[PDB]
Amino acid sequence: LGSTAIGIATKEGVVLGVEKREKIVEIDRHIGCAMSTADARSMIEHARTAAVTHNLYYDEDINVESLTQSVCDLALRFVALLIAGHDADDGYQLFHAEPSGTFYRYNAKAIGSGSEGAQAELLNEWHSSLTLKEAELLVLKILKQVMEEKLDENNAQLSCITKQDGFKIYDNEKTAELIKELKEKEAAE
Amino acid sequence: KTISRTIESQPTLDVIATLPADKKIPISLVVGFKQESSSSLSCYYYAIPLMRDRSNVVGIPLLDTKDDRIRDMARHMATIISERFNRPCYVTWSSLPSEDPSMLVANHLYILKKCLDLLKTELG
Amino acid sequence: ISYEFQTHKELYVQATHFNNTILLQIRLNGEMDSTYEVSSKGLYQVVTKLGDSADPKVPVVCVQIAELYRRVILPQFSLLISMSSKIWNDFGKLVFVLKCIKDMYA
């Protein structure tokens, strides 16, 4: 019975959003992840260890693909993850990591309870020219679209990672605006 | 950069420890009870501190074990070392042929202290 | 039971034997950041504990080191290696490291 989590990659940041009803956690300054949730502490700790070790020895961000390989390996030698990061190898990237330890790349992805629902809407709205703010709003929309109760800054939560500001979890303000702005913007007609 | 030692007194301990001459160089610590044949490796453990680009540390069982006491002892020991020496460290807890559990429960705190002390001497 | 050797950017080696496993460090300018377990099925099977588990150079270096033991150094099988990933000549390198392992009688 997994809970909703959504990611949308763009050319100016990846955006992770969840149904709050602590589900977005930082792995490194350039890599967050959102999850469907206490079986995780070990994967998270591991992830972080890998990230920090690499960074210390190389003095650079770890390759998000390598990082996702490292966490999937852990499961492979036997819980569900949306890992999102920026690196200088393949820029913005988004991955889905299954409890199985198989992972795949995506550009939009939804996991959890309304996730066949959302993935359709993702599919016919995603394109490679979307701005971060479009994506921000897009995630909010899908989240209202599927949520049990209404959408306020208290039961859904946003975050993003960008080349320049590293990872971020939006506080209730930034998000208070955006949910209000999705209200105004979807009242055009 | 490596030292064999037996730390005397509360039982006697064996300690193989690799460390720096002179910051990316990790402390390495193998440690069991000394004996009067010899030892097996029970848990290997790693830790590395977070930077102030963010007093936590982070770490993982390199070679895990079923036994909580050994895990916690090897974790706790690596956590504290890495934090206090601001270096990564690898710690092995070894185990003697028929080593009784109590010997650990009864010497957790003491082994930590005599290890902090040793490293503390051998660096500063 | 400890053995160790140092030679020449400098390469350091150290091993620690037990009933159940060996445990080898291969440091480069004191550096060490990856950990592989090279155990065998009885009658080899590398597992990545910390590092790049998809680097194809890895299980080659490991299975080499594992043979240098199993069938040339002694005196149901398990080694643990911790090393500087920065080491990867490149076959010339593996040969040097392996001669460094024998120079402390492993």
From Swiss-Prot, chain A:
<dbReference type="GO" id="GO:0034515">
    <property type="term" value="C:proteasome storage granule"/>
</dbReference>
<dbReference type="GO" id="GO:0000502">
    <property type="term" value="C:proteasome complex"/>
</dbReference>
<comment type="subunit">
    <text>The 26S proteasome consists of a 20S proteasome core and two 19S regulatory subunits. The 20S proteasome core is composed of 28 subunits that are arranged in four stacked rings, resulting in a barrel-shaped structure. The two end rings are each formed by seven alpha subunits, and the two central rings are each formed by seven beta subunits. The catalytic chamber with the active sites is on the inside of the barrel.</text>
</comment>
<dbReference type="GO" id="GO:0019773">
    <property type="term" value="C:proteasome core complex, alpha-subunit complex"/>
</dbReference>
<comment type="function">
    <text>The proteasome degrades poly-ubiquitinated proteins in the cytoplasm and in the nucleus. It is essential for the regulated turnover of proteins and for the removal of misfolded proteins. The proteasome is a multicatalytic proteinase complex that is characterized by its ability to cleave peptides with Arg, Phe, Tyr, Leu, and Glu adjacent to the leaving group at neutral or slightly basic pH. It has an ATP-dependent proteolytic activity.</text>
</comment>
<keyword id="KW-0647">Proteasome</keyword>
<keyword id="KW-0539">Nucleus</keyword>
<dbReference type="GO" id="GO:0005634">
    <property type="term" value="C:nucleus"/>
</dbReference>
<protein>
    <recommendedName>
        <fullName>Proteasome subunit alpha type-5</fullName>
    </recommendedName>
</protein>
<dbReference type="GO" id="GO:0010499">
    <property type="term" value="P:proteasomal ubiquitin-independent protein catabolic process"/>
</dbReference>
<keyword id="KW-0597">Phosphoprotein</keyword>
<dbReference type="GO" id="GO:0043161">
    <property type="term" value="P:proteasome-mediated ubiquitin-dependent protein catabolic process"/>
</dbReference>
<comment type="similarity">
    <text>Belongs to the peptidase T1A family.</text>
</comment>
<keyword id="KW-0963">Cytoplasm</keyword>
From Swiss-Prot, chain B:
<dbReference type="GO" id="GO:0043248">
    <property type="term" value="P:proteasome assembly"/>
</dbReference>
<protein>
    <recommendedName>
        <fullName>Proteasome chaperone 4</fullName>
    </recommendedName>
</protein>
<dbReference type="GO" id="GO:0051131">
    <property type="term" value="P:chaperone-mediated protein complex assembly"/>
</dbReference>
<keyword id="KW-0143">Chaperone</keyword>
<dbReference type="InterPro" id="IPR018854">
    <property type="entry name" value="Psome_chaperone_3/4"/>
</dbReference>
<keyword id="KW-0963">Cytoplasm</keyword>
<dbReference type="GO" id="GO:0005737">
    <property type="term" value="C:cytoplasm"/>
</dbReference>
<comment type="similarity">
    <text>Belongs to the PSMG4 family.</text>
</comment>
<comment type="function">
    <text>Involved in 20S proteasome assembly, facilitating the alpha-ring formation. Involved in maintenance of telomere length.</text>
</comment>
<dbReference type="GO" id="GO:0032991">
    <property type="term" value="C:protein-containing complex"/>
</dbReference>
<dbReference type="GO" id="GO:0005634">
    <property type="term" value="C:nucleus"/>
</dbReference>
<comment type="subunit">
    <text>Component of the 20S proteasome chaperone. Forms a heterodimer with IRC25 that binds to proteasome precursors. Interacts with POP2.</text>
</comment>
<dbReference type="Pfam" id="PF10448">
    <property type="entry name" value="POC3_POC4"/>
</dbReference>
Swiss-Prot record, chain C:
<protein>
    <recommendedName>
        <fullName>Proteasome chaperone 3</fullName>
    </recommendedName>
</protein>
<dbReference type="Pfam" id="PF10448">
    <property type="entry name" value="POC3_POC4"/>
</dbReference>
<dbReference type="GO" id="GO:0032991">
    <property type="term" value="C:protein-containing complex"/>
</dbReference>
<dbReference type="GO" id="GO:0005634">
    <property type="term" value="C:nucleus"/>
</dbReference>
<dbReference type="GO" id="GO:0051131">
    <property type="term" value="P:chaperone-mediated protein complex assembly"/>
</dbReference>
<comment type="function">
    <text>Involved in 20S proteasome assembly, facilitating the alpha-ring formation.</text>
</comment>
<comment type="similarity">
    <text>Belongs to the PSMG3 family.</text>
</comment>
<dbReference type="GO" id="GO:0043248">
    <property type="term" value="P:proteasome assembly"/>
</dbReference>
<dbReference type="GO" id="GO:0005737">
    <property type="term" value="C:cytoplasm"/>
</dbReference>
<dbReference type="InterPro" id="IPR018854">
    <property type="entry name" value="Psome_chaperone_3/4"/>
</dbReference>
<comment type="subunit">
    <text>Component of the 20S proteasome chaperone. Forms a heterodimer with POC4 that binds to proteasome precursors. Interacts with POP2.</text>
</comment>
<keyword id="KW-0143">Chaperone</keyword>
<dbReference type="InterPro" id="IPR053720">
    <property type="entry name" value="Psm_Assembly_Chaperone"/>
</dbReference>
<dbReference type="GO" id="GO:0070481">
    <property type="term" value="P:nuclear-transcribed mRNA catabolic process, non-stop decay"/>
</dbReference>
